[PDB]
């Protein structure tokens, strides 16, 4: 066979090509064939250049296959095996075979230059053929490849596909003929391909569908997972042909069951082709469509296909099973355009995608029901198809890639299966008849290009996991690999293309569905039975005769009945949530975080009523008292769940709004926030300030009593702490530095009897290994018939992990914190995977409680929205004036117990320590300088300061106390200042505050301007004059010259002061050229 075109005359190399994709011979394809064959006749190379997805490489492949020549497409995107490319060029030259480089532009410059030199040598050797004088009876053509004279066959050729934006290297510009494949002719491809599927009308369908894809491309919002190129269009047309043939066979079988004669042409003639194509387009696109783009897509579809609509296929059996399972698991179900219609549609789309593809993804935002949709689908197909459904949930970023896929031991060769490989091997072996069962492996975590490299082969049509051990695991047809991801920001397009997709937009789960789920869970789940009765929930399909499973069920049912009016679609909770979303919060506010926090608080409310009934066995709670209590608690929990993450002013704003919209009475005191009030066990409100005792501290522990001085901010938060620890929810506390989250959390946790606090401090290098080490330290694994359970060694104690800085762990390159995802999988799935043995282990009595600083701070990072959904976040602002006054009044009263003559001045002093401090906090801010930061840590450092000036001294006058107070004020606040006028303001304001709070104390004796305190001159820490201190420091400096460093150091006014400040800080506890000098002097 000889294939000829214009001058070119090739011979057909009879190479077996299999069922290779045929290309519609469009005008651009004909032009490309013409120019490429002309170049090959001239022995020049071919360069079809153009935008991405314009048929370049596959047109070259089509031309090579038309002449029967072996084509070898070389990719040029981070997978370019250079070490084989010299060998591959030698093979191409010797055997005779074509080589095409897809996007040769994408090569790095070194790679580009080297391959360019190789191709230049080859093409010069090929061009040496073209001269006529060279007789080929004796012509051993050769080229220099791999330092060898390799013979070149004439049939061989090389093509280089380029992407403009550009040109070829200057080496090959003279040698390669270029062709612009700028725009393939979509209409003719669609026409020929639709006519290939048997569509009676193809010109109109092609001329409609082709502009529609372009219209979708421009109009719809840009998303990575969308694809409206020629590949997607051709896949849509194949699916349309399949739907058409299915309809032919449906009508045929319907007639055959009855009494009729069959002829395929008659049935095919009378059908709507537009409806079939539209059904295919919708079935293939709408699952991927974001909720914002679906009505735009339907509008464009109506415009391009007028008077044609897509009626969704009715799956009555699956829908009934879905209704049954949803009623079983306290989930709202709908039949479309109802409460929960979109979610039902999405789970049905998930079923379709699982049926078609063997790999799929769910790409909603956090809190859209993708995990619940998948679970409901599995448990519904359970009853529908009579096949047991099993789920293997893996958080892939939590585990390392090596343990995920198993690593070959570099020495003493032995294979250790990874977790995913262990699951696949277990399924393939089928020790328990796993092949009979249906198994879905769900990667429930962020997807990255690193851990999906081995999964690319599995997700593709190969369905073969290749391991470095050399074992090739074939995926059985029962296995389905699924993905849950909040987003696909860092996913390669290669991964997305292989997988089907269902986008679960956040407006698939309405607030009404979550409220219905909460109330249904309240009405049927006893809140004290826990996990022992959790199995029995499945024993009864309706639990008849078990309405009074406990008094807990009855009381919480009454509470739910009381709460129903406020949980409506336009109730108090909905409006409160909508307003709260307008407020700015230190952490990103998610809907389900607020809702889970509120549900936990209401759970604790009904628990409190149960406690009241237990403590009043004779006359338990009446329904009126219950109504008042729950009505007030709902407002209290609404505030503390929504505005709990905001400043006091915004909490007051939300309280004002609730006062505006609510019907429940609120307190009748004008200048008190609602958050300051508690709901007592009786329905009436009561201030929190009544529940905060005034205590007295010992002098021994005056500045570090690890017991928190009870203030308002401490009697509130601890209550909330308990309300969120009874439910085992992972509490988190945030706030500016020094606020007191760590002490408050430690005291609240240690106050409980059962809790065992384990103090972990997180940092940038912390990983899952830290938590695992803590578990091996305090906890242990035990085997049970249910499975492996991790438990604390101490029986009957709830072990809690304090994660002191949850924010600080560094993100990976792809915006995921490993330890945070690990904790997320624990708190959500109630366990993790032992990687060493590759098996699921369940936590029994493990909890997490975190502290943070706001994410705006430099070393911090924002937390994952999948993780922030579980944790309730509280914002501990600074204590403020009254709280500071109480906290440090107790400390000053303890401090003055040393000298009994100044006890009466304890309270006048404390207010001063507050007032000036607050004034500084209002005058100097972080904007002026980054280090102008004030907190209660200053005040303790004030207290401690005075303490270590008062501890050795046997007695003082009040003026001495004022002088020490002023000295510590200057040493803590004046030193940090940068500007001289600020220092002068501090000088004047210390005097103003002191004389305001200490009238009839003469200022001249009490506070002379040159305030210096030193311990070198005398044994005690008492004031001294400037000249004596100058002389002592000068003598010691002269000694220092000839001792450690032999250089002159001059003493001026502004260096003696720094020496004294450094020595002072050396004398305090936890006190953090001149530094070396003062360290030497003080030893």
Ligand X SMILES: Nc1ncnc2c1ncn2[C@@H]1O[C@H](COP(=O)(O)OP(=O)(O)OP(=O)(O)O)[C@@H](O)[C@H]1O
Ligand Y SMILES: Nc1ncnc2c1ncn2[C@@H]1O[C@H](COP(=O)(O)OP(=O)(O)NP(=O)(O)O)[C@@H](O)[C@H]1O
Binding site for Mg ion (CB under 5 A): 371, 484
Q: Is 366 annotated as a binding residue?
A: yes
Number of residues engaging ligand ADP in binding (CB under 6 A): 19
Q: Binding site annotation covers 259?
A: no
Asked whether position 498 contacts ligand X by CB under 6 A, the answer is: no
CA pair distance 885, 899, nearest whole angstrom: 21
910 binding ligand Y? (CB under 6 A): no
Is the CB of 484 or the CB of 982 nearer to Mg ion?
484
Structure-token pair, residue 1039: 């000694």
Gap between the Cα atoms of 522 and 749, Å rounded: 27
Provide φ and ψ at 262, rounded to 5°.
-110, 135
- Rounded to 5 degrees, φ, ψ at 5 are -160, 115
Torsion sign across C-alpha atoms 266, 271, 273, 278? negative
Do the annotations mark residue 741 as ligand-binding?
Answer: yes
* Cα angle 267-209-206, degrees, rounded to a multiple of 5: 65
Helix, strand, or coil (residue 679) = strand
**Stretch 96-155 residues interacting with ligand ADP (CB under 6 A):** 102
Which of the choices ligand ADP, Mg ion, ligand Y, none does residue 738 contact, using the CB cut-off of 5 to 8 A by kind? ligand Y
Write the DSSP symbol of residue 314.
P
Name the binder of 100 from Mg ion, ligand ADP, ligand X, none, CB < 5-8 A by kind: none
Decide if residue 340 touches ligand ADP (CB under 6 A).
Answer: no
Cβ-count burial 36-71 (b if 16+ within 10 Å, e if not): bbbbbeebbbbbbbbeeebbbbbbbbbbbbbbbbbb
686 annotated ligand-binding residue: no
Binder among 64, 340, 673, 879 for ligand X (CB under 6 A): 340
Structure token digits, residue 598? 């509120």
Q: How far is the CB of 65 from ligand ADP (least distance, A)?
A: 13
| Options 247, 937, 983, 1036; binder of ligand Y; rule CB under 6 A | 937
Site string for ligand ADP, 25-44 (x = CB under 6 A): -x--x---------------
51 marked among binding-site residues: yes
**Which is it for strands 472-474 and 479-484: parallel, antiparallel or unpaired?**
unpaired
Which of Mg ion, ligand X, ligand Y, none sits in contact with 714, Cβ below 5 to 8 A by type? ligand Y
The response to whether 854 counts as a known ligand-binding position is no
Interface residue with ligand Y among 197, 835, 838, 853 (CB under 6 A) is 853
Sequence-distant contacts of 1016-1020: CB under 8 A, at least 24 apart:
1016/1063, 1016/1081, 1020/952, 1020/953
370 is in an annotated binding site: yes
State how far the Cα of 415 lies from the Cα of 413, in Å rounded to an integer: 7
Tell which one of 121, 719, 743, 1049 touches ligand Y (CB under 6 A): 743
Q: Which is nearer to ligand ADP, 102 or 948 (CB)?
A: 102
Cβ closer to ligand Y: 43 or 971?
971
228/814 with CB nearer ligand ADP: 228
- Per-residue binding string, ligand ADP, 604-633, x by CB under 6 A, is ------------------------------
The reply on whether position 417 binds ligand ADP by CB under 6 A is: no
230 lies in the binding site for ligand ADP (CB under 6 A): yes
Q: What angle do CA 646, 647, 649 make, to 5 degrees?
A: 120
- Residue 933: CB minimum distance to ligand ADP, A: 56
Least distance in angstroms from the C-beta of 767 to ligand Y: 21
366 binds ligand X (CB under 6 A): yes
Cα separations (Å) of 1075 from 416, 1012, 1030, 1078?
55, 19, 18, 5
Query: Based on CB atoms, which residue is closest to Mg ion, 371 or 847?
Result: 371
**940 binds ligand Y per the rule CB under 6 A:** yes
Q: Could you say which of ligand X, Mg ion, ligand Y, none residue 737 binds, taking C-beta under 5 to 8 angstroms by partner kind?
A: ligand Y
Number of residues that bind ligand X (CB under 6 A): 20
CB of 828 to ligand ADP, least distance (A): 40
User: Least CB distance from residue 505 to ligand Y, whole Å?
Assistant: 37
Identify whether the C-beta of residue 859 lies closer than 8 Å to the C-beta of residue 903. no
- Smallest distance, Å, CB 64 to ligand X? 48
Q: Which does 371 bind (CB under 5 to 8 A by kind): ligand Y, ligand ADP, Mg ion, none?
A: Mg ion
Is 735 assigned a ligand-binding role in the annotation?
A: yes
Contact window for ligand X (CB under 6 A) among 363-371, 388-396, 718-726, 834-842: 363-371
Among Mg ion, ligand ADP, ligand Y, none, the one that 53 touches (CB under a kind-dependent 5 to 8 A) is ligand ADP
Q: Is 879 in the site for ligand Y (CB under 6 A)?
A: yes
Q: State the helix-helix crossing angle for 818-829 and 768-778, rounded to 10 degrees.
A: 50
Say which residue the tokens 């002592």 belong to.
Answer: 1032
Pairing between β-strand 359-362 and β-strand 500-502 as defined by DSSP bridges: parallel
**741 in contact with ligand Y (CB under 6 A):** yes
Reading the block at residue 1028, the tokens are: 């004596």
CA distance 123 to 116: 10
555 binds ligand Y (CB under 6 A): no
Q: Is 740 annotated as a binding residue?
A: yes
Question: Preceding residues of all breaks in the chain (C to N beyond 2.5 angstroms)?
Answer: 165, 1072
| Buried/exposed 533-572: b ≥16 CB within 10 Å, e otherwise | eeeeeeeeeeeeeeeebeebbebbbbbbbbbeebbeeebb
* 448, 397 Cβ separation under 8 angstroms: yes
Comparing CB distances to ligand ADP, the nearer of 66 and 989 is 66
Q: How far apart are the first and last CA of the chain?
A: 100
CB proximity list for 872: less than 8 A, separation 6 or greater = 593, 596, 597, 600, 641, 644, 724, 729, 731, 732
Compose the 708-727 pattern: x for residues touching ligand Y by CB under 6 A, - for all others.
xx-x--x-------------
399/949 with CB nearer Mg ion: 399
- Convert residues 855-874 into a mask of x (bound to ligand X by CB under 6 A) and - (unbound): -----------x--x-----
Three-state SS letters, 610-676: HHHHHHCCCCCCCHHHHHHHHHHHHHHHHHHHHHHHCCHHHHHHHHHHHHHHCCCCCCCCCCCCHHH
List CB contacts of 1074: < 8 A, sequence separation 6 or more: 1055, 1058, 1059, 1062
- What CA–CA distance (Å, rounded) separates 248 from 267? 6
User: Which option in ligand X, ligand Y, ligand ADP, none does residue 887 bind, with CB closer than 5 to 8 A by kind?
Assistant: ligand Y
Q: Candidates 99, 241, 369, 831: give the one binding ligand X (CB under 6 A).
A: 369
For residue 328, the SS3 value is: helix
Strand partners, 733: 851, 874
| Of 399, 363, 409, the residue nearest 506 (C-alpha) | 363
Please say which residue, 739 or 821, places its beta carbon nearer to ligand Y: 739
Could you tell me if 421 and 406 are in contact, meaning their C-beta atoms sit under 8 angstroms apart? yes
SS3 221: coil
**Residue 53 annotated as part of some ligand binding site:** yes
Q: Does 47 bind ligand ADP (CB under 6 A)?
A: no
Indicate whether 364 belongs to the interface with ligand X (CB under 6 A): yes
510 touches ligand ADP (CB under 6 A)? no
Q: Which residue in the shown chain puts its C-beta closest to ligand ADP?
A: 55
Is 336 annotated in a binding site? The answer is no
The option from ligand Y, ligand ADP, Mg ion, none interacting with 484 (CB < 5 to 8 A, set by class) reads Mg ion
Q: Which stretch binds ligand X (CB under 6 A): 258-266, 513-521, 614-622, 1043-1051?
A: 513-521
Q: 738: annotated binding-site residue?
A: yes
Q: Which residues bind ligand X (CB under 6 A)?
A: 331-332, 340, 343, 364, 366-372, 509, 513-514, 516-517, 592, 866, 869
Binding residues for ATP: 50-57, 364-371, 735-742
Q: Which residues bind ligand Y (CB under 6 A)?
A: 708-709, 711, 714, 737-743, 851, 853, 879, 887, 936-937, 940
Binding residues: 50-57, 364-371, 735-742
């Amino acid at each position: 066979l000889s294939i000829q075109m214009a001058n070119a005359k090739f011979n057909y190399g009879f190479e077996y090509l299999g069922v290779q994709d045929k290309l519609v011979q469009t005008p651009l394809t004909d032009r490309c064939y013409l120019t490429m064959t002309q170049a090959l006749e001239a022995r020049l190379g071919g360069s079809p250049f153009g935008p991405a997805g314009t048929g370049k490489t596959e047109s070259v492949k089509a031309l090579g296959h038309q002449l029967g020549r072996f084509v070898l497409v070389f990719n040029c995107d981070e997978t370019f095996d250079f070490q084989a490319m010299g060998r591959i060029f030698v093979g191409l030259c010797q055997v005779g075979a074509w080589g095409c480089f897809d996007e040769f532009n994408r090569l790095e410059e070194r790679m580009l230059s080297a391959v360019s030199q190789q191709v230049q040598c080859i093409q010069e050797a090929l061009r040496e053929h073209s001269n006529p004088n060279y007789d080929k009876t004796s012509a051993p053509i050769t080229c220099e490849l791999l330092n060898k004279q390799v013979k070149v066959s004439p049939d061989m050729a090389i093509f280089i596909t380029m992407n403009p934006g550009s040109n070829l290297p200057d080496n090959l510009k003279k040698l390669f003929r270029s062709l612009a494949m700028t725009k393939p002719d979509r209409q003719l491809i669609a026409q020929v391909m639709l006519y290939s599927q048997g569509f009676r009308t193809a010109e109109v369908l092609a001329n409609k569908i082709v502009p529609f894809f372009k219209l979708c491309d421009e109009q719809l919002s840009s998303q990575s997972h969308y694809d409206f190129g020629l590949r997607a269009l051709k896949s849509v047309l194949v699916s349309a042909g399949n739907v058409k043939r299915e309809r032919i066979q449906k009508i045929k079988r319907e007639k055959e069951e009855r009494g009729e004669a069959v002829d395929e042409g008659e049935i095919a003639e009378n059908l709507p082709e537009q409806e079939i194509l539209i059904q295919s387009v919708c079935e293939t696109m709408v699952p991927k469509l974001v909720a914002e783009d679906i009505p735009l897509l339907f509008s464009l579809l109506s415009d391009v296909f007028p008077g044609v609509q897509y009626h969704r296929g009715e799956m009555t059996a699956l829908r009934e099973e879905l209704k049954k399972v949803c009623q079983e698991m306290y989930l709202t179900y709908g039949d479309g355009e109802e409460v929960g219609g979109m979610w039902v549609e999405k789970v049905l789309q998930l079923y379709q995608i699982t049926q078609i593809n063997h790999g799929l993804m769910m790409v909603g935002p956090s809190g859209s029901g993708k995990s619940m949709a998948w679970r409901v689908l599995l448990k519904a197909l359970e009853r529908l198809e009579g096949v047991e459904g099993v789920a293997h949930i893996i958080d892939p970023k939590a585990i390392s890639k090596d343990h995920l896929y198993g690593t070959l031991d570099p020495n003493t060769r032995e294979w250790t299966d990874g977790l995913f490989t262990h699951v696949l091997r277990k399924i393939i072996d089928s020790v328990r008849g796993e092949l009979q069962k249906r198994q879905w492996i769900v990667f429930d975590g962020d997807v990255d290009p690193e851990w999906v490299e081995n999964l690319n082969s599995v997700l593709d049509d190969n369905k073969l996991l290749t391991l470095p051990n050399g074992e090739r695991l074939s995926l059985p047809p029962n296995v389905r690999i699924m993905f849950e991801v909040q987003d696909l920001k860092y996913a390669t397009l290669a991964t997305v293309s292989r997988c089907g997709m269902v986008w679960f937009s956040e407006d698939v789960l309405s607030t009404d569905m979550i409220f219905n789920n909460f109330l249904a869970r309240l009405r049927s789940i006893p809140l004290d039975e826990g996990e022992d009765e959790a199995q029995r929930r499945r024993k009864g399909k309706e639990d008849e005769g078990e309405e009074a499973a406990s008094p807990m069920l009855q009381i919480q049912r009454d509470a739910a009945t009381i709460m129903q009016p406020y949980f409506t679609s336009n109730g108090l909770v909905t409006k409160a949530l909508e307003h709260a979303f307008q407020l700015e919060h230190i952490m990103d506010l998610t809907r389900l975080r607020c809702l889970g926090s509120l549900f936990s608080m209401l759970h604790q409310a009904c628990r409190n009523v149960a406690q009241y009934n237990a403590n009043h066995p004779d006359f338990p709670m009446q329904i009126e008292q219950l109504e008042r209590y729950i009505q007030r608690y709902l407002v209290y929990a609404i505030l503390w769940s929504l505005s709990g993450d905001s400043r006091l002013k915004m909490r007051a704003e939300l309280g004002e709004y609730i006062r505006r919209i609510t019907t429940v009475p609120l307190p009748t005191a004008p200048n008190i926030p609602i958050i300051d009030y508690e709901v007592s066990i009786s329905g009436e409100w009561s201030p929190w300030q009544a529940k905060v005792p005034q205590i007295e501290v010992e002098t021994h522990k005056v500045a570090a009593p690890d017991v928190v001085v009870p203030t308002l901010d401490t009697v509130r938060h601890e209550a909330l702490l308990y309300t969120w620890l009874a439910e085992h929810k992972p509490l988190v506390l945030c706030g500016p530095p020094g606020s007191g989250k760590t002490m408050t959390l430690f005291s609240a946790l240690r106050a409980l009897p059962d809790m065992e606090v384990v103090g972990l401090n997180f940092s940038s290098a912390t990983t899952p290994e830290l938590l695992l080490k803590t578990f091996d330290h305090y906890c242990e694994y035990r085997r049970t018939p249910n499975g492996v359970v991790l438990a604390p060694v101490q029986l009957g104690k709830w072990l809690v992990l304090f994660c002191d800085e949850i924010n600080l762990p560094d993100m990976d390159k792809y915006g995921t914190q490993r330890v945070i995802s690990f904790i997320r999988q624990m708190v959500e799935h109630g366990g993790f995977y032992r990687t060493s043995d590759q098996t699921w282990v369940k936590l029994e009595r493990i909890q997490f409680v975190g502290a943070c600083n706001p994410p705006t701070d430099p070393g911090r990072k924002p937390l994952s929205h999948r993780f922030l959904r579980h944790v309730p976040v509280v914002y501990v602002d600074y204590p403020g004036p009254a709280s500071l006054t109480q906290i440090y009044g107790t400390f000053n009263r303890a401090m003055l117990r040393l000298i009994p003559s100044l006890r009466t001045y304890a309270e006048p002093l404390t207010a001063a320590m507050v007032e000036f401090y607050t004034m500084s906090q209002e005058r100097f801010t972080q904007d002026t300088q980054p280090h102008y930061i004030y907190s209660p840590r200053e005040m303790t450092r004030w207290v401690r300061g005075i303490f270590e000036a008062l501890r050795p001294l046997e007695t003082l006058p009040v003026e001495g106390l004022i002088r020490i107070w002023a000295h510590e004020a200057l040493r803590l606040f004046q030193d940090r200042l940068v500007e001289d006028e600020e220092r002068r303001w501090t000088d004047e304001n210390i005097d103003t505050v002191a004389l305001k709070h200490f009238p009839n104390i003469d200022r001249e004796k009490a506070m002379s301007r040159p305030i210096l305190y030193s311990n070198w001159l005398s044994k005690d820490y008492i004031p001294v004059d400037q000249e004596e201190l100058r002389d002592y420091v000068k003598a010691r400096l002269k000694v220092f010259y000839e001792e450690e460093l032999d250089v002159p150091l001059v003493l001026f006014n502004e260096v003696l002061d720094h020496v004294l400040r450094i020595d002072r800080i050396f004398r305090q506890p936890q006190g953090h050229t001149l530094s070396r000098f003062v360290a030497w002097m003080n030893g």
